[model samples]
Target: ATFEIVNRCSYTVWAAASKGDAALDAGGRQLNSGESWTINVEPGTKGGKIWARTDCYFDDSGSGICKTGDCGGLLRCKRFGRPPTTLAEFSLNQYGKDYIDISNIKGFNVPMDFSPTTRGCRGVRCAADIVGQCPAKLKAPGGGCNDACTVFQTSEYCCTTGKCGPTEYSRFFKRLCPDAFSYVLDKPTTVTCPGSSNYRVTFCPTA
Candidate 1:
């Protein structure tokens, strides 16, 4: 299966993908506007994610910080990106389907769209001007909107306890992104495509 990362934003995006200890194609790279990179993911690959970092400045040694989605302040992420970042979660070839979703449960730094290039699979998007209209309390330092869980850290937002549900904050996110996950208990955000289908992940998809 091939996953293409396309940067449709006006600015550069530092894209990264990880599955286990090893990195996938262009595991971490700077994608300029209108540019793209494709990664070949094997069938049955599961438990991995793809995300982008913004407003980053890394030295020649690949050590620096990103305004959003900083993965331990490294150009090459050895772990998941931090909060206030959009996520493309995936589980390929599971039960003969490719499960995927664009999650804002960790909050959104950029607009994203995840869609199957192969025929027969429907597309899903989480594209919106979230940062521009972010709630006052959930705003991040540099930019982006922080998730309710990150800002409040309460059971209602975290959904940690076995008994948790949405709150006014979660509803705010859902209002903007109806098809994307807004909280941990969000069930309607998930989408599935045929196994091994080609997929596209776009930044600033609406633009």
Candidate 2:
């Protein structure tokens, strides 16, 4: 199977993916507007996420910072991106189906979409302009919208006790990306595709 990362934004995006012990073709590479990179994955690859980093500046040794979605300031990420990043998560070939979701449980940094290239699948996306409409209280200093949990650090917002639910703050993100995971308790965010199906993940789909 494969996952194609496409950049539809007007500016550059540092596309990234992380799958523990799995070799990624474009784990942390710069993709100019309209560029795309496809990564090959095994049928049962597990616990993987694709996201984009913006406003990055790397030195000769590939050490620097990103305004959003920075992975420990490394050019080749070995772990997940930080919060305030739009995430395309996958559990491929698990329990007879591929679980996929566009999640804002951490927060929203960019508009993104995910769809299968074959049949027996459905697409889910979160392409809203969350940055422009982000509430002042939940906005990140660098950029993007921060989840309520990051802002408030309460059990009600973080779901730390596993008994938490959405608050008015989570509703703000839910209103923007109803199909994406707005909070830790978001139930309808996941979609299933046929096992081994190829998928396309696009950044800034509306741009």
Candidate 3:
């Protein structure tokens, strides 16, 4: 249930978590560069989503908006953050095992390092300069990159039909962040690890 969220970005970001339609126990925390927050969650949490919001302004009541990864213009994200946001996804203590991965399927805003703190479980990292190197057509309004599915909405990129594979945009993301989940049909890169191992999710990480 232990998860440490670290903000190593050059700028500030709001770290948010959600499980389906519900916000996480801690909801979200505003963090400056080089800060950290810890959240102990439900041990049986399943496929919870964690991401960072950039260029945000929050009022005293937590009503806010971010340039990227904003969850319905609120500080406490009640739902998944909007696309063009990087993800640190995990499922803990499920059926005596744990699953973890860093996802860019929604898109990419900040770099990330998602790893386990204990046990010999493998970790994943995606700290490439994807936002800056993004293709013009896939670039977002801010420092975020748009996935083809989120941009084109075509059947090939969205993988809505039986035919699904890596398109040009998918390869662009994969070539830079190979560990990240780029598209719907990308090969499963989820890590299966031992239970009870705490995790770390770092934003704008170096590696």
Candidate 4:
């Protein structure tokens, strides 16, 4: 089966290990915010635990492995062999933002800076502010165009137009919320355009 590996850290994780040996795993390549990898593990492969190494470092401890029972428990040996079947996935929206999910591991190595596993659950949300076409100062026969739709917290922006606006002000999604996926203006879901066309909005951690 393909086990999905989600990374929720700010920096890229390299040379991830499961046991005492230093060769079981490789560095967790740079995982963009809200990105994931599917690891195909052969049944009974003796895969012990999951610990990732990153450009990030620790301040208090000497070894990446934590004491048998300490704060960073994913480092312990006993907890290495048994990892959870599935974990929640999360996305990073804003820059320099991160999220973490500590599964059922004993003394695992805590990323002094970020989370080990990415949380699962990201969707398009409306923009928090309201937008209207009244800025053009055009007087229609009947009246100015009504408010398209007030976006609350969307991952994508300008869903249909595929464009926010000529100015940054029109682009409500200048960046991202926090720990969200890449920003994408999908269709018929997250955003509405000039002709009332709907679109989906998604944001990445870097956005």
lDDT of each: 0.85, 0.86, 0.88, 0.27
Candidate 3 segments whose C-alpha is farther than 4 A from its true place: none
Worst 10 residues of 1 by lDDT: 18-27
- The candidate maximizing lDDT is 3
TM-scores for candidates 1 onward, in order: 0.94, 0.95, 0.96, 0.26
Least well predicted 10-residue stretch by lDDT in candidate 3: 19-28
| Residue-by-residue lDDT tens digits, candidate 4, 1-207 | 233444454444322323333222331223444566544322232322334332333334323431112113332222222111111122222233322222211112222112222233323222221113232221122221111122222222333456542223223222321221112332122111122111111211122
Q: Give the candidates in order of TM-score, highest first.
A: 3, 2, 1, 4
| Ranked by lDDT, top first | 3, 2, 1, 4
Tens digit per residue, CA lDDT, model 2, 93-138: 8978998988888898989989999898789899888899999998
lDDT by residue (tens digit), candidate 1, 1-207? 898999999999999887646566656889999998988887888877888899999999998999988878878776778878888888899888988888888899989988898886777788878888888999999789999889987877888786778877788889999988888877776777888788999999978
TM-score of structure candidate 4: 0.26
Model 4, 190: alpha-carbon shift in Å? Answer: 40
State the weakest 10-residue window (summed lDDT) of model 4.
191-200
Better of 2 and 3 by lDDT: 3
